[PDB]
Amino acid sequence: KARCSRKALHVNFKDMGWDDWIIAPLEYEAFHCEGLCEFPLRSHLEPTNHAVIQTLMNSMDPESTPPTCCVPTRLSPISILFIDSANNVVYKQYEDMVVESCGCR
Amino acid sequence: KARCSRKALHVNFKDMGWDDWIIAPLEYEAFHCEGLCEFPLRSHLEPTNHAVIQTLMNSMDPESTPPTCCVPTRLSPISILFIDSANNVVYKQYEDMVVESCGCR
Amino acid sequence: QCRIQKCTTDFVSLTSCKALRAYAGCTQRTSKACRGNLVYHSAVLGISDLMSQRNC
Amino acid sequence: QCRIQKCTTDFVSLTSCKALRAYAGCTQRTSKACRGNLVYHSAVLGISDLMSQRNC
């Protein structure tokens, strides 16, 4: 039972059957968030005010409100070179592709 | 076992022992998010690309990656009139206080 | 443009291999105009996984 | 300004009524300069709840 932290999560577009329309890259590290959001919340989690209030109310009465969940708070984009709907090779920057920090919400 | 949705969550500053420094309001509706994030993700959840990929990989292999969590995606601020650290009555707008929409991340 | 979100919302809000074929057809009717969106390919792969899992 | 986050991080990263009194003192040493922050009052209320729960 650890705390909200960032763990590794690799994605392989070729294994997902997307290699027919995606040229490069065929795989990348995307990470994910996992862990308990116990009271109190650390400064590195930089939670929202509502997350703070919900964590406090769940610590007081667990049968009154569920705890906050470990979720990505900051994500970084990655580039993808793919064949579009008109057979045009497009270099597009997809946002929210790699988890760079986790937190409680 | 419902889906990711917004449920009611009331907060009472007077019950939390904050009525000594908070003038008004003493209670407000903050809501919270709760429900499963099953594949596929609806349009109203407006998930991130990483959330989509994680939901897909969890639907394929549940033992490979945990599912996305139901969390607030848009929050609205509320005003608070309180006595500060210098005995000055401050009307401050606290952000991220009321859940207005839920989603999967 | 693409119509993956409408079919996805319909299929999800329905169940809240019966309509899996109907959802696959709803996604296939926009197979050309959605080549590039991650949501469409994710829905297609999930449909394939659900077809291969329920033995149908 | 306020020093609630430092004490909070220390007390959390420690346990990853022993040090609850130490954390309460760390929060009390900045009781004046943190009158208004939701994190400080939340930490104080949680400390009180943990003191009342562990019978100490």
Author numbering:
A (entry chain A), B (entry chain A): 397 to 501
C (entry chain B), D (entry chain B): 53 to 68, 82 to 121
Please give sentences taken from the publication describing this entry:
Repulsive guidance molecules (RGMs) are cell surface proteins that control processes ranging from brain development to iron metabolism. Structural analysis of RGMs and their complexes with NEO1 and BMP2 revealed a common RGM architecture comprising an N-terminal domain (RGMND) essential for BMP binding and a C-terminal domain (RGMCD) sufficient for NEO1 binding. Here, we determined high-resolution structures of all three human RGMs in complex with the BMP ligand growth differentiation factor 5 (GDF5) and the ternary complex of GDF5 with RGM and NEO1.
The RGMB–GDF5 interface is mainly formed by two interaction sites. First, a short linker between helices α2–α3 harbors the “RGD-loop” in RGMA and RGMC (“RGN” in RGMB) and interacts with the GDF5 wrist region. Second, the RGMB α3 helix stretches across the two GDF5 fingers. Under these conditions the RGMB ectodomain (RGMBECD) bound GDF5 with an apparent affinity (Kd) of 8.8 μM, and the N-terminal domain alone (RGMBND) exhibited a Kd of 2.7 μM, suggesting that RGMBND comprises the major domain for GDF5 binding. Mutations of RGMB at either of two key RGMB–GDF5 interactions (Leu103Glu and His106Arg) abolished binding to GDF5. In solution the 2:2 RGMB–GDF5 complex is stable at pH 7.5, but dissociates at pH 5.5, similarly to the RGMB–BMP2 complex.
